[PDB]
A paper describes a structure:
Soluble HMW1C-like N-glycosyltransferases (NGTs) catalyze the glycosylation of Asn residues in proteins, a process fundamental for bacterial autoaggregation, adhesion and pathogenicity. The heart-shaped structure of AaNGT, either complexed to UDP-Gal/UDP-2F-Glc or UDP-peptide, shows the N-terminal AAD domain and C-terminal GT-B fold catalytic domain, which is composed of an N- and C-Rossman fold subdomains.
In contrast, the UDP-Gal and UDP-2F-Glc pyrophosphates are only recognized by the side chains of Lys440 and Asn520. The sugar molecules interact with the side chains of His276 and Ser277. Furthermore, the Gal moiety specifically interacts with the Gly369 backbone, while the 2F-Glc moiety interacts with the side chain of His370. The superposition of all ligands for all three structures (AaNGT/UDP, AaNGT/UDP-Gal, and AaNGT/UDP-2F-Glc) clearly shows that the sugar moieties of UDP-Gal and UDP-2F-Glc collide with Gly2-1 and Asn30. This suggests that the sugar nucleotides adopt unproductive conformations in their respective enzyme complexes, which could explain why we were unable to get a ternary complex resembling a Michaelis complex at a structural level. Furthermore, this could also explain why UDP-Gal is a poor substrate, and UDP-Glc mimetics are inhibitors of AaNGT. Likewise, the interactions between OH3 and OH4 of Glc with Leu368 could explain the poor interaction with UDP-Gal. The results of our ITC experiments demonstrated that the product of the reaction, UDP, binds to AaNGT ~ 3–5.8-fold and 18-fold better than UDP-Glc mimetics and UDP-Gal, respectively.
Author numbering: 0 to 621
The structure:
């Protein structure tokens, strides 16, 4: 068939390896991994032959692909004549999360069998220790293949002293997957969140780090369980600020407050704002309402649709991928309008936005919690959040503007089902428990908790995981992880179209929410299907939303657990107590608390920010 561009090819990769054309082999491997990255794990459009038995068996074909690719990478990286360049190593660190899955979704688990070929010390105390010859080539190959699922010992202080850039690059790579759930991967990331911030702080630029996964580092620390998990963000901001200044940046001087139609100007900088996205559903009504106090200028990408653009008085596209040009365009927009407020409803999904948060454009700079975590930025004054979603204020470096619980009325998805079907089983022989969670939300604590519920419950249970982001070569690994805790008592469903996803959940008798990072959309889905479930609460907003939303929707407090032991007890109770469970489901079906999420007075955000501006003006005399 005709296509836009030649597909990356396993055959061409293998051929280059055979010919010891190392440059062409590296190029083909990077092209394969980059295309997988583009398609979020899907391997369509990567060329390979396979036995005809696998034509209709997608999971088996994916494992075959991962196995074949693992074999080829083994042949290449074990070759002592293969010399990896520094720019080569940098490109591999950016896609290490995909390398991980090539091994982790194969039967091999990891690339440790390659690492073992690099050991030069026959007198080692442990097979888990790898001693390298003192050349940068073997150190880089070691580090590139030190994967999340590796069982090899690595002492970070040792690596740091040997080569800071390689050490830092590996630490980025190990933070960057969207599934860091296994004991081995979660343990590495855990250790990094404690050890790495004081080291990362020492970098002055991002030039020798894998820059393209910086925003993943920024976002992903929120899925760890440590109280101080967001510390790496403070460190990353310092590096970003330094990097920005070393590119010649100068902060805007605030000398005037511009007016348009007699109102001060709010510039809104958007990461995702298509009307099909959550952030539009959660945050658009309060922006529209703020036009009563401010003139709103929205800056977003080409992909924003008309409904998205229309929330603003005027809208401008960000032309291209260059971050300096974006900040320059934003700077000129704030200068031209003498902007009063800079608002970012989400920060973290784009590196450009993180740069923005580390510079001065307007006297009041504000985020909302599209990604629910503190910035640790010195340049962000305020966070907009619903009062009932806040746990501890100490989780944020910013000052929280705690709005009324109805101040951000949601807009319903247009894909919302209109003729929901209900299965209310009176006395099921097996209680089917649905878990709607992106892979980022899975971790050993959560899985161990489910295992305990299974082992202690006096009813039989089966866990159905509806796994957002478990796509293509991600899936076997995630499935094996689940199996390692729950055996035959769980089913791992790949990321699916919305209707399939709702079919999976609707056949469950109850749901359980992940922790520490809970759900929002998944709770909406739950009550849409007339289901009930248990959640865990805690101090972060991303821990506490579930509690607030359950209360908004009229679910009772016993379903909201403080400790892990509490969660276990409440989950068992909901599973065992068939009549109690069905009564709550009848409450939810009849009450339709969902409709109340779409109502509220949206004016507080505008009014609160206007009051803050007033106070700023009379403090500063501008
Ligand atoms: O197999 C699947 C899994 C999920 N979904 C859909 O995806 C929704 C869940 O959204 P995501 O997959 O993006 O997961 P989250 O709800 O955790 O994500 C949302 O909340 C985040 C903050 O935690 C960010 O704001 C993110 O961009 C936003 O989508 C579900 O309600 C459903 O509509 C499917 O259709 N099929």
């Amino acid at each position: 068939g005709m296509s836009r561009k030649k597909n990356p090819s396993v055959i061409q990769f293998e051929k280059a390896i055979t010919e010891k054309n190392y440059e062409a082999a590296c190029t083909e491997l990077l092209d394969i991994l980059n295309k997988i990255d583009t398609n979020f794990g899907d391997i369509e459009g990567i060329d390979f032959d396979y036995p005809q038995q696998l034509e209709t068996l997608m999971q088996d074909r994916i494992v075959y692909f991962c196995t074949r690719m693992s074999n080829a990478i083994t042949q290449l990286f074990c070759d002592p004549q293969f010399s990896l360049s520094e720019s080569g190593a940098n490109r591999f660190f950016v896609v290490q999360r995909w390398l991980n899955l090539i091994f982790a979704s194969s039967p091999y688990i990891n690339a440790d069998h390659i690492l073992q070929t690099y050991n030069c010390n026959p007198e080692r105390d442990s097979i888990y220790d790898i001693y390298l010859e003192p050349n940068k080539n073997v150190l880089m190959k070691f580090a590139v293949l030190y994967l999340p699922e590796s069982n090899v010992n690595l002492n970070l202080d040792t690596m740091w002293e040997t080569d800071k850039n390689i050490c830092g690059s590996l630490c980025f790579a190990l933070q960057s997957p969207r599934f860091i759930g296994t004991p081995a991967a979660f343990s590495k990331r855990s250790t990094i969140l404690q050890w790495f911030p004081a080291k990362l702080e020492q970098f002055h630029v991002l030039d020798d780090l894998p820059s393209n996964i910086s925003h993943d580092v920024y976002m992903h620390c929120s899925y760890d369980t440590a109280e101080n998990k967001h510390n790496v963000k403070k460190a990353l901001n310092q590096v970003i600020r330094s990097h920005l200044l070393k590119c010649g940046w100068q902060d805007r001087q605030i000398t005037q407050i511009g007016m348009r139609n007699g109102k001060p100007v709010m510039v809104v900088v958007l990461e995702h704002f298509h009307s099909s996205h959550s952030i539009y559903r959660t945050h658009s009504t309060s922006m529209i309402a703020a036009r009563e106090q401010f003139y709103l200028i929205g800056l977003g990408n080409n992909a924003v649709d008309q409904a998205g653009r229309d929330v603003f008085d005027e809208f401008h596209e960000f032309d291209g991928s260059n971050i300096l040009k974006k900040l320059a365009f934003l700077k000129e927009m704030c200068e031209k309008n003498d902007a009063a407020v800079l608002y970012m409803p989400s920060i973290g999904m784009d590196l450009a936005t993180i740069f923005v948060s580390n510079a001065r454009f307007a006297p009041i700079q504000v985020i909302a919690l599209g990604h629910p975590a503190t910035t640790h930025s010195e340049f962000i004054e305020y966070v907009i959040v619903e009062d009932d979603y806040v746990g501890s204020e100490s989780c944020f470096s910013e000052t929280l503007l705690r709005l009324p619980k109805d101040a951000l009325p949601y807009v319903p998805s247009s894909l919302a089902p209109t003729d929901v079907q209900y299965v209310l089983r009176e006395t099921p022989e097996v209680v089917n428990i649905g878990i709607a969670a992106t892979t980022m939300k899975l971790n050993p604590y959560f899985l161990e908790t489910l295992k305990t519920i299974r082992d202690r419950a006096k009813v039989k249970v089966h866990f159905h995981f509806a796994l957002g982001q478990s796509i293509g070569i991600t899936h076997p690994y995630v499935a094996r992880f689940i199996r390692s805790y729950l055996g035959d008592d769980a089913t791992a469903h790949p990321h699916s179209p919305y209707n399939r996803y709702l079919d999976i959940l609707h056949n469950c008798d109850m749901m359980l929410n992940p922790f520490p990072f809970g759900n929002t959309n998944g709770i909406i889905d739950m009550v849409t299907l007339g289901l009930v479930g248990v959640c865990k609460t805690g101090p972060e907003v991303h821990e506490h939303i579930d509690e607030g939303l359950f209360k908004r929707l009229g679910l009772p407090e016993w379903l909201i657990a403080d400790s892990v032991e509490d969660y276990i007890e409440r989950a068992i109770r909901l599973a065992e107590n068939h009549q109690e469970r069905l009564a709550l489901r009848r409450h939810i079906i009849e009450n339709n608390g969902l409709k109340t999420l779409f109502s509220g007075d949206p004016s507080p955000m505008g009014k609160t920010l206007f009051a803050k501006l007033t106070e700023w003006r009379q403090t500063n005399g501008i």
